[PDB]
Amino acid sequence: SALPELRELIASFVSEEPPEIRRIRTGTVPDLPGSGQYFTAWDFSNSIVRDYAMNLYQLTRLATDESVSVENLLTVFRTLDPIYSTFLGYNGFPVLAEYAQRVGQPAESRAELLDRLTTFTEYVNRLTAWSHHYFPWDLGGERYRYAAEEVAAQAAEASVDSLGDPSQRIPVRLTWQPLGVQVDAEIYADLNPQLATDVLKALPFTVLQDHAVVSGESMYAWAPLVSVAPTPVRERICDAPVGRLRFSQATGNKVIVQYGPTTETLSSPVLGKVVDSHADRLAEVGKAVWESTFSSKEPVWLTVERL
Amino acid sequence: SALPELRELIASFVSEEPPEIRRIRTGTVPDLPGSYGQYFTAWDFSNSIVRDYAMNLYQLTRLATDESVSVENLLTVFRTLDPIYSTFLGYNGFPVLAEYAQRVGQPAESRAELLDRLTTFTEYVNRLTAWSHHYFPWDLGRYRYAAEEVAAVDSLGDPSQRIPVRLTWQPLGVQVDAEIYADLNPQLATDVLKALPFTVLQDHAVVSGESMYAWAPLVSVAPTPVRERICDAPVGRLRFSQATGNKVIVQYGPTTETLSSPVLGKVVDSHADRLAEVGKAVWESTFSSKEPVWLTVERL
Ligand SMILES: N[C@@H](Cc1c[nH]c2ccccc12)C(=O)O
Ligand SMILES: N[C@@H](Cc1c[nH]c2ccccc12)C(=O)O
DSSP states (O other): OOHHHHHHHHHHHHHHHOHHHHHHHHTOOOOOOOOBBBHHHHHHHHHHHHHHHHHHHHHHHTOOOTTTTTHHHHHHHHHHHHHHHHHHHHHHHHHHHHHHHHHSSSOOOOHHHHHHHHHHHHHHHHHHHHHHHSGGGGGTTSSOOHHHHHHHHHHHHOGEEEEEEEEEEEEEEEETTEEEEEEEEEEETTTTTHHHHHHHHSEEEEEEEEEOOSSSSEEEEEOOOOOOOOOOOEEEEGGGTEEEEEEEESSTTTTEEEEEEEOOSSSSEEEEEEGGGTTHHHHHHHHHHHHHIIIOOOOOOEEEOOO | OOHHHHHHHHHHHSSOOOHHHHHHHTTOOOOOOOOTTTTTHHHHHHHHHHHHHHHHHHHHHHHHHHHOOHHHHHHHHHHHHHHHHHHHHTTTTOHHHHHHHHHHHHSSSSSHHHHHHHHHHHHHHHHHHHHHHHHHHHGOOBBBBHHHHHHHOOOHHHHHHHHHEEEEETTTTTTEEEEETTTHHHHHHHHHHHHHHHHEEEOOOOOEEEEEEEOSOOOOOOOOOOOEEGGOOOOOOEEEETTSSOOEEEEEEEEEEEEEEEEEEEEHHHHHHHHHHHHHHHHHIIIOOOOEEEEEEOOO
16 A cells, blocks of 8 residues: 555554544643633634535545646645644644645656545545544534524425335344444445445444534534545435435545535535434434534444445 | 626635624524534534635645646546535535535636635635634534643745735734745735735634734735744744635744644744733633624735
């Protein structure tokens, strides 16, 4: 591989909290940053590793585009990257800074560059998944509320499950521990073929389950993969039914179970759906995952398995 | 300019808070972003993305001046990196920036046309980011360091290219005089001088330490052969990082950021005593009060 030790980190951090995050969230970052508080530095570390994960994923994706010369991709990299890597090194992620330098070093094949890009992205995606689990979203929870009536009102202001072929549905089970909850889901292999491929290849796995903090009632967890598969079928998130399983290679590789009303209007690649029989089981897990992500940080693990 | 409707807003928003910024700060975004009836998380996201979005727009703009990178190869990179950022920014209370992102991506009939849209747009986004930094509720972070643990170039160049200028903070009433080193980063200094005079909101660093900065009205890709580690900077140092958006940075004490920063000039030693008093009111402005403070920079 291009960076085998990186892969060792990517493996460890599936089950385990990366040290960076632990020193970040307890204001123990050696450089003691943040103009006698650290929240602002912490906020920065979180948001910027998130956006760097996106950046990198689009560089990874660009790398599949042979109209852009490998050298042009590397040039683009050396330009856009340092402002992110150097700052992240300063603010809690110094290993990432050195590895970012490594990814840029003069490479000799597209495949090699691309292998670095996919590797690095996976690493940063996991740093981002942990960073997301631990950020104090509860802060504006007594300070800044949407008022109930306006909310129900905008809910009042406003098929892709019928496309393709039922014969090609591939079954799987989602298991949420320690809740001991379980549903059986179907994956539309026919809709986004290499997408669902990339997702079933990874199976099984056990990752951490967290909650959306913008779009509404939408759980997502960061799967151990990077897919650049076509996404011909995408569905707007506000139009998603309850129980929809959407992937989002754009934003890491999040297995996004949607269980309740969401407001986001950006389109999302369709993976599958929970079997109607088990959709009602979702509200509970969704509330407990809101609790963990918003509040308690009590980890809730996902296991996805090929039935 | 390739986008005049954009130029007019670039002007207005130096003086007036962008409706978007306020709408998000008050959580009035029609799409009610934020899970479970609160908009702090959405507020954070919008601010965070719009800030790093500008960073990406700037590095793109620098790539647009790079003649090895093809204009079409650039269009391709743009059309790849831009959507995941701009379309969410369109969902989180910035529909206009999302409409303009697409216009920026349309096929450029020249490299200058494309460099131009990127300049006007980078600046528009840098101004939205300026106000968002000003209004984000940093005081909400409760997350304080331990007291014990917190406890725990001007010579170089030519004295005839020291261009005098005056920085006046309002309502601070403090008007320090200063010299810009027109000879250390000529291209950058020239860029800075052609914007004088301006009057933009003065805001404080939130991660760096005792340093202030204000989004100037310019987009410079000018080389910066003379830089100094932020940590090693004298009180009264003027620096200018266009990488994170052009900001006139005034350092008024010790900092801990170890990145290097373009050397723009210095406040004269005499007036440096006045910087401390204006650092505090600015910190309390950004962190707590949000009460505006306006920096005017003009040439004497
Ligand atoms: N809709 C997402 C916002 C988002 C966009 N890109 C992301 C990447 C990682 C995490 C969250 C996001 C949310 O509610 O959280
Ligand atoms: N050092 C900066 C952090 C930063 C990086 N990029 C930025 C862009 C805009 C504002 C701030 C930043 C600070 O203390 O704030």
